[PDB]
Every structure is written in C-alpha cells, then in structure tokens.
DNA sequence: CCCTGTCTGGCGTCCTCTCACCCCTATGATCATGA
DNA sequence: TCATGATCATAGGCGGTAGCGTGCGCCAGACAGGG
C-alpha cells in the first residue's frame, strides 16, 4: 500500500483512541431504554458532530510491514505473504508446517 | 642555571605579556625570536633570581 | 532571663528544667507523634519534633554557665556568630499551635508502603506491602509469572525480617 | 592507554553526578551478621558492585556463556571486583558548602576574587553575619558586610525589594552574579588610571587571577560544592584485626560524619526548620 | 495450593521446565502433586502462498502451545520463596495460583 | 631475606613490607635518583612498573620469564589509578588528556 | 599609603628489625527464686 | 502466680554542672597597626 493509506490509517487510530470514552458514553445513552427522549436525541445528534474518523468501525486491519489491507492476520499483524516469509525465516516463535 | 629560571618582562610589545608579568625564560625567549625574526617588534626582559 | 533557643540533650528535661523551671522558666521544641514498630510492637509517642533544639529562659551573668555545665540541655547556644544568639520566639508569639505537616512518623511506614517484605532466602527483591494490614502474616506480595499475592510473613518479619 | 597531558581543572557538579554510578544515602558500612554489606550505605554492592567475582549478591549467574547480563534480584551486574577500585559514588549535599582548599590557603582564591578579605568571608560561610546580594535602590552597597541588629534595620525600614543571605548560599550567589567581562575591563581601566604601588600589585594581581580564569573554561560557583564525591572502596579498606571488630581507617568515619549530619539536615529541612534555627545544622554540615 | 500453569511453543524446553520446578518445590517441601499434561492446543493457519493469484496454492501452519499443570500441596516457609529467585528458562510462560 | 613473587597489599597493589609478612626490600627515592644519574631506563622503568605495581604487567613478565621471552609489556602503575581517584574524590578534576 | 609588627602557614634523612596496643561501662531485658 | 533482683548481653564519640594546653625553630608572605 502506499505512505498515504498508512498515514490516513495511523490518524484513524489516533483518533479512535482519543474519542472512546465520550463515544462510548454517547452509545450508552442512546441504548439506555430507561432515559429521557430528548435526550436521547441529543445524544444521536452529538453522536454525529464527532468526526467520522473517530469511529472503530472505520479503521481497516493491513500489515504492519507493507500495509496490505488483504489478506490479513490478527495473531501476527502481518499480511499472508509476509507471515509465510517469517513462518519460513524462523521468525516467528512456535510455528511451523503443519501435517495431519 | 636552575636557580635564575624566571625572569620579568618591562615592555609588553607586540607580543602578549603584561608589564609586571612573571614567565619564565626560555618561553619569552622563543617568543621574541619568533617575533624579531620577521618584520616585527620583539618583547624585551629582565631576570630575576628565585 | 528570657527565652534562648539551645542546642540541648535529649529525652531528660525535667532536671536541667529543674534547674530551670524551679523558676517561672519557658522551654519549648517543636512537636511530632511517633508511630513506631519498635521491636514486633507498633509505638506511639508524641515527642519533640527536633533533635536538641530546646527553648529555655534563664540570666546569663551572675549565674555563670560552667557551674550548670554538669547537666544535659547543653550543647551550645544558637549564634550564627560569637556571641550566643538572642533568638526569636516566634512560635511563642506569633506560630503558638502547629505540626499540620504530617506525622508521617518520619521514615516509618504507614499502609501501602513500598521498601523490603522478605528477608532470610526471599528478599533480594523489594516485593511490597500492598498493605501492612497487621504486622503478623500472609502470603508475600510476590510476583512471578502469575497473580500478585501480598505478604509471605510473620509478625517481626514484613519489614525488615 | 597512550596518553601525552594529564590536564587538571576544577569538576562541575555534573561531572561529579557524570562520574557516580549511584547515590549514597545512609551511614552503614557492614551488616556485622555477616559481612554483606547494607544497601546503600558506604560499602555497597548495587552502587559499587560485586564483593567476589561473578558471584552475584543475590546469585543466579556463574556460566562462561552467560556472561553481559546483570542480576534482578540485588540488581548486581555479575562482573569483576576490580570495578569496586574504580566506580565513584556521589552524596548530594542538601545545602551548598564552601570548599576549604579555595577558603583558607592563603592566598584565599574566594577572596581575591570577590575583592573581599577573608575574615568576612568566614564570619558568613560559618553562619554568623549577612552578607548582601542584590542591594537595590536602598542605602546599601554589595560586598557590605552586616550584623544582626543591621539586619534587623535592613528588614524593618526595607522589608521589600532589598535582599541579604548568609553562608554557602549567599557566596554562591555572589559567585554566580560575578559578571567576569566588566571585571577585566574594570580592572584593566583602573591599572591605567589610579597608578598607586600597592594598588598596582594588588590589582594586577588579581587581574592575573581573572585572565587566567577566564581564558580556561572554569566557572566561579564551581568553587562551591553541591555535589560531593566519594572514594570508591577498595581504597578506602576496612581491614579486619582478627579479634571479632573492625579498627576502622580514618576515611570512612569521615565519610560516616557527613551522612550522618546530612540526613539529620534533610529531615530538619523537611519537618520546617523554627525560623532563625536552620543554620547551626548547616554550620555543623560545613565543618564536617 | 499452588497451581502452576506451564506453557510453552516447544514440548522439551516445556518438559525441562516442568522437571526443574519440580525439584525447586521437592527440596523445600513436600508432597509435590505432579506434572499433569492438559491438551495442546494447535492453533492452524491456511494461507495463499503465491503473491498474487494461485488459490490451490496454499500453505498450513500450526502452532503447538503445550500446557504443563503442576500442582504444590503443602505451601511452607521456604518452598513458595524459593521461585521468586528461582527463575526458569525463556520461551515458557508460567503462572503460579495459590488457593 | 629473598622474594621472587609474594603476595600484594591491597590499597595500592605494590608488595608488602617487612620479613614475617614475605616482603621485598623498598626501592626508594634516593635510589630512583641514582638511576636516574646513570642513563640505565629500562632497568626504572621494570623497576617501578612491572616488578612493583601493574598487575596485567607482572602476570605478561611470569608468563614471558616462565617461557624465556625477556620482554616487558608496561602498562600504567595502580598506585597512579589511586593518585587519580584520591585527587578526583575532591573538587578537582584530573584527567588524562588525547 | 608606607612602613613595621604579628600571624599562621610551610618545612625539618634513609633503610631495616623488634615489641605492645586496637573499648569498657551502663542500661535494659529476661529468667529464676521467693513469698 | 506475681514481683523483685541479679546476671548477661548489646549498644556510642573532651566529661562535666570546668579545664585540660606550657621543653622547637626558621623563613616567608600576607594581614594589619601606627603614623
């Protein structure tokens, strides 16, 4: 992926991990059944001033090494290909070719 | 000779001494040969006894 | 005869103040509560705040100061210069009542401290106190590769074994 | 190694911070059960090192293909003993002390280069007189000297902006508001101007001083310690008389003094000192 | 008593680790429970190996973290210290649970 | 009294003094200046770095003497190491310069 | 400021050999015996 | 069972309600006294 996607990517992350409690608080209210309509609506109408970004849901999992967006993997962090590199290169702890 | 080592400059001249300045003697002496030796004004001295 | 801050001894007012307060004499330090674990046994002692420090009110001249050296309350006067100081009493006239700092008891600890918990084999390593809850004993606080369990020890022993 | 100066200079306090590994605190020098000795006192191990050879403290490394890596217990990187004849440790003073060397060695270099005689220097380094920095637009000069009832003066007709102190503090602040570039010019204007004999000597004598403190790279409040050293160890051993006690050398009761009258100081400054009080414990911290 | 909950990627530095805290708590103290094998966990993971398109083309790895429970009866004085400078060999996370 | 190799006191690592403490006989000052009246050199300096003080320097002299190699390694004398910390323990900074 | 007295800092051989000496006193705590 | 007395072990810097110091000598350079 280019510098670009991963420095978009890098704000993204920043951002969530800046507006999480106040996100969350918003989301609770707005859940909250026993809790004044208004406010409610408030709450939904806060929701949307805050910047899109800030959203968990907006931020894609790439590789740590070359940002690919595809073909990724949560243990590792890294995209097939580079896992495969590492598995092969010794790198990564435990894992090996796998037969049965 | 290791008794009168040091010696007392009278005329600072275009050197970097003062006028009541104790330095010893050779290094005053390489000084104003260096100097006289082109087409400068040496440093002159006076000895003293220690 | 008035108030002169000394350098003194300890712990033996009552006859150098016998001595002075036979008179109407005036002594004072400052002040500190005590809560020590002295051996296995916590202590509590509202002593002097300060080393030999000590205010008292005596006459210098007729009554010459080598016939009262015998006693304790003397190291020497407060001078800043020859002459012995006359010194201020500024907690007798204007700071009568204080002590608000703390009485952090000082350098001994209160709950949830952080200094050495296992001597003997287990110590080389300042495991902690999450709370001197009573000086008798727990289960360290140890931590390795799993919970942090606090303290592995009996009564003399978390502290200074 | 290969070498062709030793050059001598004075030590600024990072330098003495630069040199020490750590920081002694307390007077101790050997638990007396056994001989390990108590942390951190004078003979230590977490600040100094290992007693024996690779032979941590604590005890968990003695392999020859482990060798780098340092303990976690005692802390003890498991090295050699010959590192207790080199590394230093520092005690932090809690208030300035005055050097003696520069005091009273007649020349006294603190005061010739104050332009200050040496008998009010002692009157305010051993904390019975004032000394005044920063004057202000007040009927008192700089290097003036004071007494109590002057003081007294000085603080009921001038409570304000005026300013005086006393002992290792005031001398390094004096020392620190030298100002050298007007001295020398100073000076050099008034060897050209007064032409008197024994002005001529004194004077030039101390701008000898000053040339030669200004062309080196030397400071003035360097001449006062805040930060002490101490000498590691092994040079200062404890040698034992084989009778169950330790006939100690000189150096570590020194050494035990100082700690000893500092802590005392530390505490006094924490619990408040009683208003004209905290200065006989910064007499006594100066003579020891 | 003391749980310890050993686990590791390799099965023999597992082992060793299991055999060496064994002897930590056995001279100390006594009745030592033992070292119970729980199941391994295989953890698989299929992927494309080509860069760009070959989807047959695949390879699987595994990875084997292995459990060692053991298990300290009689908790004394001595024997509990003893692990704290007692540490064990590196790639073998353990987890010690009293009670 | 002789002495090859005895043991070293501890402060400053140089042999000890006396005959019950297995000692060597001092090499002293007014004999450093007759050697150096004469223009004998390397016979002061094995005579004040590796006989006397550095310890690399006498271990590399018994390995090469053991082994017929007559030669010297010098090195620097412990005793200056002290010089240089009993000084630095004041205010005064002493280095070695280049 | 120009002497002239006082003051306090420096310094005072080398090498070796032998021997002694290198806290005791006071206070507090614990144990045992007697009432 | 409780209280008192005796013995043993462990713990710090003139000792005292002052005064101890007193039998080297020269040189030298700064600090200050007198005029």
């Known amino acids: 992926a280019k510098q670009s996607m991963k420095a978009r990517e890098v704000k993204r992350v920043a951002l969530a991990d800046k507006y999480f409690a106040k996100r969350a608080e918003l989301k609770a209210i707005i859940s909250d059944v026993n809790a004044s309509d208004e406010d409610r609506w408030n709450a939904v109408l806060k929701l949307q001033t805050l910047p899109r970004d800030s959203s968990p849901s907006r931020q894609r999992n790439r590789c740590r090494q070359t940002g690919r967006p595809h073909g990724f993997l949560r243990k590792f962090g890294l995209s097939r290909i580079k896992v495969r590199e590492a598995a092969m290169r010794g790198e990564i702890p435990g894992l090996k070719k796998a037969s049965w | 000779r290791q008794m009168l080592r040091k010696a007392t400059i009278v005329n600072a001249g275009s050197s970097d001494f003062l006028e009541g300045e104790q330095v010893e003697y050779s290094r005053v002496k390489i000084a104003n040969r260096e100097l006289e030796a082109n087409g400068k004004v040496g440093a002159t001295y006076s000895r003293d006894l220690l | 005869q008035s108030w002169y801050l000394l350098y003194c001894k300890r712990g033996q007012l009552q006859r150098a103040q016998e001595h002075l307060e036979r008179q109407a004499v005036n002594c004072l330090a400052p002040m500190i509560t005590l809560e020590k674990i002295v051996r296995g046994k916590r202590t509590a002692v509202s002593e002097p705040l300060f080393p030999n420090y000590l205010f008292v009110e005596f006459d210098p001249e007729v009554i010459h100061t080598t016939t009262i050296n015998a006693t304790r309350g003397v190291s020497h006067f407060v001078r800043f210069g020859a002459s012995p100081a006359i010194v201020p009493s500024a907690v007798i006239h204007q700071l009568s009542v204080y002590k608000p700092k703390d009485i952090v008891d000082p350098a001994t600890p209160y709950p949830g401290d952080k200094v050495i918990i296992t001597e003997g084999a287990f110590e080389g390593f300042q495991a902690i106190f999450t709370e001197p809850d009573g000086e008798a004993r727990s289960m360290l606080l140890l931590n390795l590769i799993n919970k942090e369990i606090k303290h592995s020890v009996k009564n003399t022993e978390f502290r200074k074994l | ?288 | 008593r003391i749980r310890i909950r050993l686990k590791a990627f390799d099965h023999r530095l597992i082992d060793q680790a299991t055999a060496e805290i064994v002897e930590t708590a056995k001279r100390t103290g006594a009745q030592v429970r033992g070292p119970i094998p729980l199941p391994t966990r295989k953890e698989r993971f299929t992927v494309l190996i080509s860069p760009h398109v070959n989807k047959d083309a695949r390879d699987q790895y595994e990875i084997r973290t292995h459990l060692r429970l053991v298990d300290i009866v009689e908790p004394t004085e001595k024997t509990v210290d003893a692990l704290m400078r007692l540490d064990l060999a590196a790639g073998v996370d353990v987890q010690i649970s009293l009670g | 009294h002789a002495r090859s190799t005895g043991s070293y006191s501890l402060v400053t690592q140089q042999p000890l003094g006396g005959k019950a403490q297995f000692g060597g006989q001092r090499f002293g000052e007014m004999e450093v200046w007759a050697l150096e009246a004469y223009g004998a050199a390397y016979t002061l300096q094995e005579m004040l770095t590796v006989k006397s003080d550095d310890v690399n320097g006498r271990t590399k002299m018994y390995k090469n003497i053991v082994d017929g190699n007559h030669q010297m390694e010098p090195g620097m004398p412990e005793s200056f190491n002290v010089l240089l910390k009993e000084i630095r323990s004041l205010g005064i900074n002493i280095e070695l310069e280049d």
């Open chain 4, 1 to 288: 190694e290969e070498f062709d100066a030793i050059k001598i200079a004075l030590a600024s306090p990072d330098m003495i911070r630069s040199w020490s590994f750590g920081e002694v605190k307390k007077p101790e020098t050997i638990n007396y059960r056994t001989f390990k000795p108590e942390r951190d006192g004078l003979f230590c191990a977490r600040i100094f090192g290992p007693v024996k050879d690779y032979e941590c403290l604590c005890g968990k490394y003695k392999r020859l293909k482990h060798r780098g890596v340092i303990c976690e217990k005692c802390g003890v990187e498991v090295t050699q003993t010959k590192v207790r004849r080199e590394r230093m440790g520092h005690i932090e003073l809690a208030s300035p002390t005055a050097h003696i060397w520069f005091l009273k060695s007649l020349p006294s270099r603190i005061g010739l280069l104050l332009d200050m005689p040496l008998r009010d220097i002692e009157r305010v380094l051993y904390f019975e007189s004032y000394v005044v920095i920063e004057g202000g637009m007040t009927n008192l000069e700089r290097q003036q000297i004071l007494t109590e009832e002057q003081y007294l003066d000085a603080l009921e007709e001038f409570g304000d902006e005026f300013d005086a102190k006393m002992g290792a503090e005031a001398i390094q602040a004096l020392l620190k508001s030298m100002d050298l570039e007007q001295e020398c010019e100073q000076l050099r204007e008034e060897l050209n101007e007064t032409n008197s004999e024994t002005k001529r000597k004194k004077l030039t004598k101390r701008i000898k001083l000053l040339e030669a403190f200004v062309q080196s790279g030397n400071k003035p409040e360097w001449m006062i310690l805040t930060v002490l050293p101490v000498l590691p160890p092994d040079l200062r051993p404890l040698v034992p008389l084989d009778g169950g006690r330790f006939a100690t050398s000189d150096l570590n009761d020194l050494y035990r003094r100082v700690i000893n009258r500092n802590n005392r100081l530390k505490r006094l400054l924490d619990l408040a000192a009683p208003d004209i009080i905290v200065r006989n414990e910064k007499r006594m911290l100066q003579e020891a």
